[model samples]
Target: ATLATKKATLVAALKDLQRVTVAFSGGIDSTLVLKMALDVLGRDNVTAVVANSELFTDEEFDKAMSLAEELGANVQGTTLDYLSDDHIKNNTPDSWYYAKKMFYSRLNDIAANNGSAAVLDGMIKNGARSLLQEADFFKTDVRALAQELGLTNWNKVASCSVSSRFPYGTTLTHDNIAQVMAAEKYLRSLGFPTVRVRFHNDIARIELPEARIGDFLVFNDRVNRQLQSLGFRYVTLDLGGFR
Candidate 1:
């Protein structure tokens, strides 16, 4: 189907809900949902609930708030400290599972209290199929729709929780999360649009686009120095490039 048809289908599905509380992450996916919900249900019938957490960067939070305001969606901000939860504080390998459960639970509560019949997410209908097939077709379609709507972050790279920077067995901590965030923020300032600073003990494993490997090497010394000052004992690049 064409992008317009797919979008119309999406609108029809959303309109079926009549009223909904959206889990607005400020990213393209959620942003698109917010935009569509506003279009179908109007600002009064759609509530954009943004979760404020350490897992997300302040920059993203601000952008989400600004975008929601621009779209004239009813914005609701909620602050959550995952670390305060016992399961999350333990930092087991399964901590992420528990953390996400808590996050979704908050969204559910918001939906219930706001008189919304359903909690909406920006998940694409073909997301599971796209992931299994290892194709970008679904993403391309979404981007096309975003462009048609003039969304500012139509081409924004995917983002994840800061905890993802740590290896599976590494203990998650506020300090490490801070270090990773700082390192990535610095890396982006250097013009690496898609980068990941994976944390391993005191080492920082940098991942960048394959095409930009040489570009990164030119600033190796500077990058190492900056990361070291941020408490990373060593900084190394991933030969396999960004993944």
Candidate 2:
């Protein structure tokens, strides 16, 4: 099925639910879902809930707020210290996992308090397991977890969180994520086709398509110097290119 058609069908189903609490993260996928939910269910029917904590960078919260404002959805920012939450902080795979779980629990609580029948989320396949589990905890099933959840409306909600764009080995930090966002924004301003900055502990890895490592070499020292000023100790051009 086409992506647009699937999104339409999901919106239609959501409209039937009458009310839904969306687990919003201000990421691409969740932002889209929140927008659709607001369209189908009305602003009063949908609540954009953000799970705020140390694990999530300030940039994430800013993006969430921006998206919520753009969508005209009712935004509820909740602060639940994931580290204070025992099950999530230690047992989860990483900060990403714990942050998402906290989001789910907060969304569920909002739904329960508001007496909403369903809690909708934007969960894509090949995403983290804990997110799928959180959806299951609310009885929402992803096709990826079809066997476990015994359901398959996986395409019902677009799972498009921006975090999914990063690979597993990539180092995650507030500054790095912000730097990547900033660099890409700057590159786009220069009419660059596409640019991605991959973060390693002490390195800022730039990914550009079909470009020679040397094409960037001219700017190497300056770029490296600039990135290092952004908290990276070193900057590099990936010889293998961007993925």
Candidate 3:
């Protein structure tokens, strides 16, 4: 389907639900989904639920809150302390499965208490198939993790904010998220915009607008050292930019 048609379908789906509590991550996809839901079902019928914890950064929390305010949607922020436990110890794959379960359980409990009928997510087309398949695998009737959590009909709209697909062997870590966020924040402080920090293990690949590349290179070493101190083994730039 065309982008417009897909968006229309998503809006219609949101309208059909009438009332929803979105699993707001304060990221691009979730933010856009929340925006559309509020538009389709009205601000009163929609709520933005933010899951805050060590797994996420403070900047993420602030951005989420700010976006919800802009959308005029009621925001619910909860801190899930359990996320701090190293999942590797439990032999649980620290991938999307962990994220889905964490989000589903927390949102389900919160929505049940608040009387919301459904849960919305920010999943996109590229990763949606894999995510859905994994959810089906872990879901059970007794727990009804997906169904009971009000995500049986969870909707996601494909958007530029889905985050670029990184290659395998990519080192994913909590510190990685922080370094990326911190580096971007630093660049923004210098009035730089339209930047994306892509990670590949020890190397930090940055995508900047061509016009700003020269400016970025001027302070490249300083930025590199700062990010390295943040735990990156090395810092590099993606010559291809934000393709």
Q: Candidate 1: where is the Cα deviation over 4 Å?
A: 1-5, 86-91, 127-137
Tell me the deviation in Å of residue 8 in model 1: 3.9
Kindly list the per-residue Cα lDDT of model 1 for residues 1-243, writing each as its tens digit: 566666666766776778888887776777777787787889889988888898878777777777788878889898888887765665667878888888888888888898887777666646011110122226677677678888775327666777677766566678988889999999999999789999887789998999999877779999999999999999999999888
Q: Model 2: which ten-residue window has the lowest total lDDT?
A: 151-160
Per-model TM against the reference: 0.87, 0.57, 0.58
Q: Once superposed on the true structure, which residue ranges of model 3 sit more than 4 Å away at CA?
A: 1-8, 26-28, 88-93, 127-184, 187-215, 224-243
lDDT of 3 by residue, 32-137 (tens): 6676677677877777887776444566676677668776789988887443444421324454455556658888777677767777775554311122222222
Candidate with best lDDT? 1
How much is the lDDT of residue 135 in candidate 1? 20
The superposed Cα distance between candidate 2 and the true structure at residue 207, in angstroms, equals 4.2
**lDDT, candidate 3, residue 240?**
77
The TM-score leader among the candidates is 1
Model 3 CA lDDT for position 173: 49
